[PDB]
């Protein structure tokens, strides 16, 4: 039962560094070298470097020169990832180990640790109702309403329609950065049912303890 | 640095069918190559070690071949849970490098996007903000081009796009495109258009509105 337990996600400021953790278990920690891999949405997976707990120290990837100076510690079988500068280092970092003795392929991986670099502070989201121009209800047999959530930090926010009773025809999209995470959701129902049968989006933001239930109404 | 190239970011397949992902190492990495699979929000899973060896527990449907500069991952008969990302990785000489990955997706009937455009809400305008939102939902193939036009001229500054992966139920894709201006600039223009170019129609799908005009 080989297992690698990584650390919870952290939100460092665009300036300092953060030491990540990886608790190996189920095998003699010193018998295998630990590896670290980075994964960003646009650049894919990139190997960072390895470490020998038996002590052969390290060997880093050219690209992660001094921005990543690994370290470890026996008597606890945990490996650490320093992360120096940090600013464009926002991504998920993995802890990896190989399986057999003669293949550098990574058979064992940690669950990964998300790292977000931002100077923003906890901020409640503004929620904006999206209704078809001039109220009405479209021009077909179906009408689409929406909810725009922006200016919040940090992730995440939960969004439902009519307290969850409206789940079909819903499209809720991944939030995108921009100082204050912004996301949106659309709901599509039968034209004759709105505004006859009310529709409200419920947005909740754990970090700020805030909730907003914005009803969607015809507008001019 | 050796460069692993996976020429296909996405590959259309079907359940019960055969599919082959290809990988091309910039150099002869001999047989030092591995294949990984990854599902959203999870870590990579080793599927193949040393070019063509199944790791333990990896089902017979998964196969890999090649040795030299060209390698190929194959799935005899695709199953629902195989519609994920597969990564190539050479471990011949450091630094270890991974391919860009290939996402397998379910092929289905072409479907035109339903496009909806929304003017800024009064509540946002009071805060000095003006976001125009455009939804493009339930379309297939994923290939789509969204353009914004303000008073006719195309606008690229201030556009933020978001999309969902292929739906696990209806195999379509959806997308949101938001044009965010300040109320100051928003009120200095009159015509706002969201234009979707998709293979399902010769003419791009267009949705618009005029400030203050119903």
Domain coordinates in residue numbering, chain A: 1-120, 121-220
Q: Strand A142-152's sheet: what is its strand order?
A: A126-130, A142-152, A181-190, A170-172
In 3-state terms, what secondary structure has residue A195?
coil
**B214/A186 Cβ within 8 A:** no
Nearest to A177 by CA among B165, B161, B129: B161
- In chain B, CATH 2.60.40.10 covers 1-108, 109-211
Q: A1-120 architecture in CATH?
A: Sandwich (2.60)
Method: cryo-EM
* CB within 8 Å of B93: residues ≥ 6 apart: B2, B29
**CATH domain B109-211 topology:** Immunoglobulin-like (2.60.40)
Q: How far apart are CA A90 and CA A117, in angstroms?
A: 6
**A178/B46 Cβ within 8 A:** no
- The CATH code of domain B1-108 reads 2.60.40.10
Q: How far apart are CA B19 and CA B5, in angstroms?
A: 18
Tell me the residue ranges of DSSP E strands in A86-191. Answer: 91-97, 108-109, 113-115, 126-130, 142-152, 158-161, 170-172, 181-190
Neighboring chain B residues of A107 at a CB cutoff of 8 Å: 46, 49, 55
Query: What are the φ/ψ torsions at residue B147 (nearest 5 degrees)?
Result: -120, 145
Reported as half-sphere exposure (CB side, CA atoms, 13 A), residue A74 has a value of 12
- The CATH code of domain A121-220 reads 2.60.40.10
Q: Which of A99, A183, A219 sits opposite B162 (nearest CB)?
A: A183
First to last CA, chain A: 63
Q: How far apart are CA A37 and CA A92, in angstroms?
A: 9
Reported as half-sphere exposure (CB side, CA atoms, 13 A), residue B145 has a value of 9
Q: How far apart are CA A124 and CA A143, in angstroms?
A: 29
| Adjacent-strand bridge partners of B115 | B136
**B118/A130 Cβ within 8 A:** yes
Tell me the residue ranges of DSSP E strands in B26-172. Answer: 33-38, 45-49, 53-54, 62-66, 70-75, 85-90, 97-98, 102-106, 114-118, 129-139, 145-150, 153-155, 159-164
Q: How far apart are CA A196 and CA A36, in angstroms?
A: 56
Fold agreement between A1-120 and A121-220 = yes
Reported as half-sphere exposure (CB side, CA atoms, 13 A), residue B191 has a value of 10
Reported as half-sphere exposure (CB side, CA atoms, 13 A), residue B171 has a value of 16
**A46/B133 Cβ within 8 A:** no
């Amino acid at each position: 039962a080989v297992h690698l337990q990584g650390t919870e996600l952290v939100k460092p400021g665009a300036s300092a560094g953060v030491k990540l953790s990886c608790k190996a278990s189920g095998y003699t920690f010193t018998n295998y070298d630990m590896n670290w891999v980075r994964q960003r949405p646009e650049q894919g997976l990139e190997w960072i470097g390895w470490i020998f707990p038996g002590d052969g120290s390290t060997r880093y990837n050219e690209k992660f020169k001094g921005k990543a100076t690994l370290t470890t510690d026996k008597s606890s079988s945990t490996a650490y990832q320093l992360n120096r500068l940090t600013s464009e280092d926002s991504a998920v970092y993995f802890c990896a180990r190989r399986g057999f003795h003669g293949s550098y392929s990574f058979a064992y991986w940690g669950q990964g640790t998300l790292v977000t670099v931002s100077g923003a502070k906890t901020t409640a989201p503004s929620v904006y109702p999206l209704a078809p121009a001039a109220g009405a209800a479209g021009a077909g047999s179906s009408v689409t309403l929406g909810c725009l959530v922006k200016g919040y930090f940090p992730e995440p926010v939960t969004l439902t329609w009519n307290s969850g009773s409206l789940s079909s025809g819903v499209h809720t999209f991944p939030a995108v950065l921009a100082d204050l995470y912004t996301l949106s959701s659309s709901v599509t129902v039968t034209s004759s049912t709105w505004p006859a049968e009310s529709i409200t989006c419920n947005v909740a933001h754990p970090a700020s303890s805030t909730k907003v239930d914005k009803k969607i109404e015809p507008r001019g | 640095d050796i460069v692993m190239t996976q020429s296909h970011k996405f590959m259309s397949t079907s359940v019960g069918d055969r599919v082959s992902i290809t990988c091309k190492a910039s150099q002869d990495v001999n047989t030092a190559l591995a294949w990984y699979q990854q599902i959203p929000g999870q870590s990579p899973k080793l599927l193949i070690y040393s070019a063509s060896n199944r790791y333990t527990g990896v089902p017979d449907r998964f196969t890999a071949s090649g040795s030299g500069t060209d390698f190929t991952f194959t799935i005899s008969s695709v199953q629902a849970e195989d519609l994920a990302l597969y990564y190539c990785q050479q471990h011949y000489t450091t630094p270890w490098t991974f391919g860009g990955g290939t996402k397998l997706e379910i092929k289905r009937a072409d479907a035109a996007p339903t496009v909806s455009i929304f003017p800024p809400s009064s509540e946002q305008l009071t805060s000095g903000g003006a976001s125009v939102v455009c939804f493009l939902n339930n379309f297939y193939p994923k290939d789509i081009n969204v353009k914004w036009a303000i008073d006719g001229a195309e606008r690229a500054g201030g556009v933020l796009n978001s999309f969902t992966g292929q739906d696990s139920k209806d195999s379509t894709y959806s997308m949101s495109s938001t044009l965010t201006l300040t109320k100051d600039e928003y009120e200095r223009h009159a015509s706002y258009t969201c234009e979707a170019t998709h293979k399902t129609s010769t003419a791009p799908i267009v949705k618009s509105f005029n400030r203050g005009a119903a």
